[PDB]
């Protein structure tokens, strides 16, 4: 709930939320420290075909203990107020599941 | 009025909102036999040809007492603030109403 | 001022907002009190052939002063900060305009 | 900095946005004592249908030292964080450049 | 963290979001040296009338020890929290990768 990081992960909401909506890729880091995989950097992508990741992003991500996924479909957005499953969630076309951070 | 409450939250009316006005339809995670009743999960899908809810969202509404309604269109937003009907609904197009749990 | 009647009105302003921009009409739960009438809620329909105001819209307007005001159509909507019509204001396709309430 | 002229600033970004990634002209009371002239209200207008302001949107400038703009498009947002350019701007097919107030 | 640069480095936000889901350019001053490089200001632009900045936004630009760039059609929104790489981010169809200010 602090500054900096409350933005960014809003932002991700947004970028979440977006790629739902408007059928828009996206590229994740996403923590394998966890099921499912929170979410750490998330790329909303317009346009590159196949050529997914910007190379930017993916300098981010092999530094990183996470792994990185590259031209998903985000077909799912999901929020839980429930306290055993509390917290925001994405889902991908082939079934895959991420929580998204929170700060 | 707290956190994290308030993103989820707020995260469901996000939902809500885009459903209603996009018109692509939600499954909830909700309870079933009050009016209104409550939403304690919800999902924003697009193309999810393979799953009605993710089974994400199927599992997560098998730990509760609450009950998974899917499929639905939210053909209504209400934003209320007289003295005791303060609080914001949502209508299906076939008269079920919610209330969006606040927090 | 408090929520949690500031997280009602700022949906009220997105749905305000929302049937500017998209032609969906709204149903207002609203005080001659005032001139121009203050919105003390406002239902957002996406629907049909409409039938009209969700009946759960209607029942909590009927249990107030408030007149009940049904399928209209907003085509302005303003923001004016003016030491004299501080506040927000929808304009119906008849001319009509109403306040915005806040709080 | 304060309740509640913060909402109304806040909508006028809103409604200025609304109004360059939708090109649904806008109405403007401003006060040329600037320059560019500071936005005191706007006024956006969707099915205005052959344009025109709001009789009540007009009334409320004509008995301020504002000046009323009409029928205007506006195609660029921007926002500028330089030391002696802070602040939000909107600009027209004519190039004219207003200034949003902040609060 | 503050007053008033929160308001306008979030409006930078939203002006990078939505030219990321429209197609809509942008210009941009920003500082010259600098990898990734910061923004200092953002301009959205529906068209195209003239292609390029507009006269308003070039003079804050050219006073300034920053690069004006004109006509830049971002591709990525890159929110990250992470460690090395905290904030928000865009990236242009030539690999141009832009830090977008906090405050």
């Known amino acids: 709930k602090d500054y900096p990081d409350?933005?960014?992960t809003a932002e991700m909401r947004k970028i979440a939320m977006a790629a739902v909506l408007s059928g828009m890729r996206?590229?994740?880091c996403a923590s394998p420290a966890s099921s499912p995989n929170?979410?750490?950097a998330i790329e909303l992508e317009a346009e590159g075909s196949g050529s997914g990741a910007?190379?930017?992003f993916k300098d981010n991500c092999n530094r990183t203990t996470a792994s990185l996924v590259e031209g998903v479909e985000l077909t799912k957005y999901?929020?839980?107020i429930?306290?055993?499953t509390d917290g925001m969630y994405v889902v991908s076309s082939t079934g895959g599941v991420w929580r998204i951070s929170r700060a």
Chains 1, 2, 3, 4, 5 share one sequence.
Do not use: L, P, R, T
């Open 6 to 8: 409350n933005v960014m």
């Open 26 to 28: 996206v590229n994740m």
């Open 38 to 40: 929170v979410i750490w």
């Open 54 to 56: 910007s190379q930017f």
């Open 78 to 80: 999901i929020s839980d």
């Open 82 to 84: 429930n306290n055993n």
